[PDB]
């Protein structure tokens, strides 16, 4: 399971 | 008998050509079993593995959604990039991330992962306590002081100890047939003449799961690494793998020499020795 | 940064003159992932030739299996020519079937 973790840089 | 879980995205800027191109994969040890392409027709994450073809609707639109976020964060994250090292819109360039997690044979957790390339070379990581952050360089710094003030360790940690290891016991009961099987690799030697002086012997290791074997070269029972060759593990392109191992031999003592195979699927240490 | 591949050309199974079978190369630990590899039969290009999805190791660098179904021959000559932008020229690595 891949999770949500769309962070910016 | 310990077991891994890794998601591997990759996105290239293409400048002209369109929108980056986005490549997500998911392996649990070394099989493969989703991937994403922002290149095909479905735009959905995709199965690659027999076993996970059983998960119901939410699941693949929570990993589409997930997924294809990711590549979306990575096209803003091509351009931000482009800011901090000041460089031009002419130029192709790669981000690439890891994030998994390590259960031992017990199934408890073992480690968590997240790490990002710029270019490949390490741009920003997670240290193995899960709570603080190695950036390479001033640019990844701009990247750590965010990522410290939106507290992004404390979520990731979160996923990692619980989600992450839940999910791949889960995946190793539901495809426990392909991923805890330990298929033995069938062994053989070949002989080829060098000169009438000297011969190769060739030691082969084929259909075998996991990847991880040792192959060893031994003259009389003592360790051999002077004229020998070993290549590297390679899939077989059916969920297996093979290796090889030579050494060049005097002609006549070819059975002076033994080659030692060592894998999970063998109850003991299988040894070779030429006719 | 900038990574030469490797590259191995082999079979799936032990090669028997008249049996399918599926002919491989493996390129790995390349930088950066753009790619041209070709599967050559008597010095010509095979055009059905799938490839897995790219995926990288460790340090970051690629790995690809470029791979096609064929029935080897005693005549039949085989062999995987790579382009990667590390290379001075297209490398060709033939196929031997005891390799
Ligand atoms: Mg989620
Ligand atoms: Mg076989
Ligand atoms: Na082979």
């Known amino acids: 399971y891949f999770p949500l973790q769309s962070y910016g840089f | ?275 | 940064i900038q990574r030469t591949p490797k590259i191995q050309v082999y079979s799936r199974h032990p090669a028997e003159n008249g049996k399918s079978n599926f002919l491989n190369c493996y390129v790995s630990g390349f930088h950066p992932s753009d790619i041209e590899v070709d599967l050559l039969k008597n010095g010509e290009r095979i055009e059905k030739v799938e490839h897995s999805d790219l995926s990288f190791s460790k340090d970051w660098s690629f790995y690809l299996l470029y791979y096609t179904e064929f029935t080897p021959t005693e005549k039949d000559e085989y062999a995987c020519r790579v382009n990667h932008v590390t290379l001075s020229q297209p490398k060709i690595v033939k196929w031997d079937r005891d390799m």
């Open chain 2, 1 to 275: 008998g310990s077991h891994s879980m890794r998601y591997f995205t990759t996105s290239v800027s293409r400048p002209g050509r369109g929108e980056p191109r986005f490549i997500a994969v998911g392996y649990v040890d070394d099989t493969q079993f989703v991937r994403f392409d922002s290149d095909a027709a479905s735009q959905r994450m995709e199965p690659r593995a027999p076993w996970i073809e059983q998960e119901g609707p939410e699941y693949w639109d929570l990993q589409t959604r997930n997924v294809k976020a990711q590549s979306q964060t990575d096209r803003a994250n091509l351009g931000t990039l482009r800011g901090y090292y000041n460089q031009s819109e002419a130029g192709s360039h790669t981000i690439q991330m890891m994030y998994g997690c390590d259960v031992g044979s017990d199934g408890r957790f073992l480690r968590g992962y997240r790490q990002d390339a710029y270019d490949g070379k390490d741009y920003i990581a997670l240290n193995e306590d899960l709570r603080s952050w190695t950036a390479a360089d001033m640019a990844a710094q701009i990247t750590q002081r965010k990522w410290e003030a939106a507290r992004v360790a404390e979520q990731l940690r979160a996923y990692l100890e619980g989600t992450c290891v839940e999910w791949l016991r889960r995946y190793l009961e539901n495809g426990k047939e392909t991923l805890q099987r330990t298929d033995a690799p069938k062994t053989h030697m070949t002989h080829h003449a060098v000169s009438d002086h000297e011969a190769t012997l060739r030691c082969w290791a084929l259909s075998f799961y996991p990847a991880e074997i040792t192959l060893t070269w031994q003259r009389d029972g003592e360790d051999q690494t002077q004229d020998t060759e070993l290549v590297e593990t390679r899939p077989a392109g059916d969920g297996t793998f093979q290796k090889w191992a030579s050494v060049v031999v005097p002609s006549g003592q070819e059975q002076r020499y033994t080659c030692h195979v060592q894998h999970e699927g063998l109850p003991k240490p299988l040894t070779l020795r030429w006719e």
